[PDB]
């Protein structure tokens, strides 16, 4: 029950009513530090614990592909919490109004939320603390090491973040205690009206055939566990050598579950650590899910402008500024990028995989973002194009990994300077020819036509 995982957002008079767990980022019942800590206060105050989820008005900025995935998991989560005698209340509207009224109407004793370094979450918090007088607590249930404890400042590179995080692993990498059970309407109806409001925004092909294919990733806490088990048994050993090959589905495919909190990253690392495998494959995977995933939270926590040109490293800002007026080979607008109407078939295939499956391969994701910088009027124009496309079509989008990853590809955050080139300056450059020497670009293109 390590107290380093919890910050105090605002102190106040401890109410005599139930502890309310405001669930935003970690939509699961198993392996949830925020859920288990909320139960701890409930036992200490002789009072039950309840869970509240807010359905905000920002869902219309994304597609149905993310709406049903989240809502389907919440339907499963509702059953799980009822098995432990924990009621779950689902509210519609924005949290600033909804959380304040629910606390007043229920006389909540303590308010607990999970941690997210995103700008929108801080916006919701700022409205909440100005509407309640009960204590407000928040718990990092997303990172193995708490984000404010891994580092106290912005980390310039992964090689400076790795020694700090690994030094704290023996303390924070621990098992999850069991969620002991306890001593504003239906979920299906909200789904019904949600798609009806989103249906005009459906991504469609020429013949009005829906582009999205929902059979690639089943949502829910249960489906996440099988994916983790399938990756360890079947794909973990080849991960070290085939993670850069989009033609092979050797990735873990855990990101849609990780983003929604349907599976805990600590559970993944615990299971991978005791599994016996090729030694590189374990280290390569551990680097992504521990170093790179949790440095993405660090990037968003300590940079208020994580989605802006201002948060780029000084060398990258100077190089891109010096190459701002360089004539670009081609310029594409947002619609051409969206529908895949560029001269690059490799980029077009990556966009089609994104539009069809909702999860573009990690290696082609780097190629996809860097070509936006090459084919945009300004680095700022490419930054918003990349963010707009990523948050709209990726199942794992609107995530700290997304903004950190875009910043890495476009602004070279958590990277070093490379050879000076036109337009892109010293930013790491990936070429169509270089991709051909790494993997078979042909079979990747045919698969997504
Ligand atoms: C431009 C760009 C945008 C991205 N947008 C997102 C996004 O919106 N959401 C998202 O979850 N990831 C994003 N990624 C990070 C990475 O692409 C995905 O985490 C990864 O592709 C997810 O597929 P996987 O789980 O099967 O890969 P795996 O090889 O299995 O990786 C395992 C886990 O490690 C983490 N991870 C892996 N690679 C990275 C990385 N480069 N940075 C941070 N964490 C990583 C992920 O949590 C991942 O689930 C982005 C990467 C780039 C370059």
């Amino acid at each position: 029950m390590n107290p380093k995982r919890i910050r105090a957002l605002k102190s106040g008079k401890q109410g005599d009513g139930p502890v309310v767990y405001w669930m935003s980022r970690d939509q699961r019942a198993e392996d949830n530090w925020a859920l288990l800590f909320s139960r701890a206060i409930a036992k200490e105050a002789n009072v039950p614990v309840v869970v509240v989820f807010c359905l905000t008005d920002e869902f219309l900025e994304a597609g149905i592909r993310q709406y049903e995935f989240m809502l389907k998991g919440l339907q499963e989560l509702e059953v799980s919490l009822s098995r432990k005698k924990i009621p779950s209340f689902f509210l519609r509207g924005d949290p600033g109004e909804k959380i304040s009224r629910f606390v007043k109407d229920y006389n909540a004793g303590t308010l607990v939320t999970d941690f997210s370094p995103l700008r929108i979450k801080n916006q919701w918090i700022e409205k909440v603390i100005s509407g309640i007088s009960i204590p407000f607590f928040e718990v990092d249930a997303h990172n193995v090491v708490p984000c404010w404890e891994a580092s106290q400042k912005h980390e310039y590179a992964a090689h400076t973040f790795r020694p700090k995080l690994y030094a704290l692993l023996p303390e924070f990498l621990e098992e999850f205690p069991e969620l002991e059970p306890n001593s504003v309407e239906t979920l299906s109806d909200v789904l019904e009206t949600g798609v009806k409001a989103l249906l005009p925004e459906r991504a469609l092909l020429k013949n009005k055939d829906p582009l999205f294919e929902p059979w690639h990733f089943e949502p829910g806490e249960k489906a996440a566990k099988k994916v983790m088990e399938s990756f360890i048994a079947d794909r973990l050993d080849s991960y070290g050598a085939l993670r850069n090959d989009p033609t092979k589905n050797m990735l873990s495919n855990l990101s849609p579950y990780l983003h929604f909190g349907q599976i805990s990253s600590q559970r993944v690392v615990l299971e991978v650590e005791k599994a016996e495998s090729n030694p590189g494959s374990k280290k390569a995977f551990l680097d992504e899910i521990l170093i790179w995933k949790e440095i993405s939270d660090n990037f968003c926590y300590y940079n208020p402008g994580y989605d802006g040109f201002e948060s780029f490293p000084s060398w990258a800002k100077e190089s891109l500024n010096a190459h701002r007026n360089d004539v670009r080979s081609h310029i594409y607008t947002l619609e051409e990028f969206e529908a895949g109407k560029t001269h690059d078939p490799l980029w077009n295939a990556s966009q089609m995989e994104l539009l069809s499956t909702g999860k573009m391969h990690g290696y082609t994701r780097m190629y996809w973002a860097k070509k936006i910088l090459e084919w945009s009027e300004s680095p700022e124009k490419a930054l918003e194009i990349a963010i707009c496309l990523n948050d709209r079509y990726e199942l794992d989008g609107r995530d700290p990994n997304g903004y950190a990853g875009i910043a890495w590809s476009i602004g070279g955050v958590h990277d070093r300077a490379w050879g000076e080139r036109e337009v892109t300056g010293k930013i790491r450059y990936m070429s169509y020819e270089g991709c051909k020497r790494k993997f078979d670009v042909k079979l990747y293109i045919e698969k997504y036509s």
Side-chain angles (χ1 to χ4, degrees), residues 1-10 12 14-19 21-36 38-43 45-82 84 86-97 99 102-103 105-132 134-152 154-155 157-161 163-183 186-188 190-191 193-195 197-204 207 209-221 223-224 226-247 250-276 278-317 319-328 330-419 421 423-432 434-435 439-441 443-449:
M1 48 76 164
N2 197 323
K4 275 197 261 183
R5 291 201 198 269
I6 312 121
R7 319 219 299 309
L9 286 174
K10 187 193 235 91
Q14 174 108 2
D16 54 90
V19 177
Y21 164 44
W22 173 21
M23 182 185 65
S24 151
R25 194 191 190 175
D26 291 284
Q27 297 158 26
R28 66 185 178 277
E30 287 285 308
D31 308 333
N32 197 331
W33 294 120
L35 180 57
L36 279 153
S38 52
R39 182 66 185 88
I41 312 152
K43 192 73 192 92
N46 293 96
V47 73
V49 63
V50 300
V51 178
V52 50
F53 185 89
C54 208
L55 203 287
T56 69
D57 316 303
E58 281 85 26
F59 83 100
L60 290 124
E61 292 171 354
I64 100 103
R65 63 185 59 196
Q66 292 100 351
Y67 202 50
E68 41 169 37
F69 196 96
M70 189 201 29
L71 245 32
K72 286 206 200 102
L74 290 182
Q75 274 226 111
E76 177 181 317
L77 169 145
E78 224 270 311
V79 180
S80 304
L81 287 200
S82 284
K84 281 79 136 203
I86 329 182
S88 43
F89 301 93
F90 295 80
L91 284 200
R92 333 164 174 80
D94 259 38
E97 215 177 67
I99 294 289
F102 186 86
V103 160
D105 290 359
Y106 248 93
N107 182 4
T110 298
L111 188 69
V112 186
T113 193
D114 47 47
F115 168 71
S116 178
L118 284 189
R119 182 171 309 135
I120 309 206
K121 186 48 189 281
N122 298 177
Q123 176 73 70
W124 292 333
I125 290 172
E126 289 298 74
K127 318 293 273 224
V128 159
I129 40 83
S130 187
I132 50 138
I134 85 161
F136 195 12
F137 266 142
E138 62 143 74
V139 181
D140 189 341
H142 217 82
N143 294 293
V144 179
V145 173
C147 178
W148 50 92
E149 280 284 344
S151 285
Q152 281 73 253
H154 162 79
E155 292 294 328
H159 79 85
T160 71
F161 192 65
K164 296 190 190 187
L165 198 72
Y166 275 104
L168 294 167
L169 261 196
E171 233 277 347
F172 287 109
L173 183 43
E174 280 187 14
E175 272 286 351
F176 282 95
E178 211 189 314
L179 178 72
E180 183 237 335
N182 267 324
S183 301
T186 46
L187 262 279
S188 63
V190 180
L191 189 32
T193 166
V195 199
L198 202 293
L199 264 181
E201 204 199 16
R202 276 289 334 190
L204 302 174
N207 46 345
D209 224 49
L211 262 157
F212 186 60
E213 297 163 356
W215 60 80
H216 295 271
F217 311 98
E218 179 184 0
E221 173 137 48
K226 318 190 209 265
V227 171
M228 181 193 47
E229 292 173 7
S230 283
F231 167 66
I232 290 171
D234 255 25
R235 305 190 290 279
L236 171 63
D237 292 324
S238 301
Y239 180 89
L242 299 186
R243 69 190 274 305
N244 293 12
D245 205 308
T247 72
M250 213 46 64
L251 298 188
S252 71
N253 299 337
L254 266 306
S255 63
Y257 311 101
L258 284 174
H259 157 75
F260 285 106
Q262 287 177 5
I263 194 170
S264 163
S265 163
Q266 195 167 337
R267 170 58 55 196
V268 181
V269 62
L270 275 160
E271 284 280 25
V272 174
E273 279 273 0
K274 69 183 65 172
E276 278 317 350
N278 165 316
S281 265
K282 280 181 66 158
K283 199 92 183 276
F285 186 70
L286 271 37
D287 285 345
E288 318 289 346
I289 206 143
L290 262 200
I291 305 313
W292 289 105
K293 171 177 171 297
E294 302 205 5
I295 207 179
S296 306
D297 265 41
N298 168 267
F299 176 58
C300 294
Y301 186 63
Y302 292 113
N303 291 275
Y306 56 79
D307 70 344
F309 158 83
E310 62 258 26
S311 66
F312 290 172
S314 316
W315 66 266
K317 291 191 279 205
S319 311
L320 291 156
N321 283 354
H323 292 278
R324 263 177 191 269
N325 300 318
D326 304 11
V327 202
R328 274 83 166 126
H330 211 309
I331 302 280
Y332 302 106
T333 55
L334 176 62
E335 234 60 63
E336 322 174 46
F337 277 132
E338 214 172 337
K341 281 133 173 183
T342 71
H343 294 339
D344 195 334
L346 175 58
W347 195 101
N348 219 307
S350 302
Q351 182 66 21
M352 180 73 19
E353 174 196 29
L354 168 55
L355 289 171
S356 297
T357 50
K359 187 175 169 291
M360 180 198 303
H361 191 274
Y363 194 67
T364 43
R365 223 181 269 221
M366 283 174 294
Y367 184 91
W368 170 84
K370 282 177 179 293
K371 289 327 194 198
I372 307 206
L373 181 67
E374 262 192 309
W375 311 330
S376 279
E377 285 137 18
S378 69
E380 293 86 0
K381 211 38 91 183
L383 201 89
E384 66 210 310
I385 286 170
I387 292 163
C388 190
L389 292 179
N390 195 68
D391 293 352
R392 172 59 187 80
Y393 296 119
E394 284 287 344
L395 293 168
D396 51 21
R398 319 176 293 301
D399 198 88
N401 295 345
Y403 307 111
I406 283 163
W408 179 95
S409 304
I410 286 168
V413 173
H414 300 142
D415 209 357
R416 307 138 113 203
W418 290 86
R421 305 172 207 267
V423 159
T424 47
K426 292 183 177 179
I427 305 303
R428 184 204 296 273
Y429 170 67
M430 291 185 26
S431 66
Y432 182 92
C435 289
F439 66 121
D440 186 81
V441 277
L443 303 139
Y444 187 71
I445 286 167
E446 318 189 66
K447 188 165 149 206
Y448 307 100
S449 55

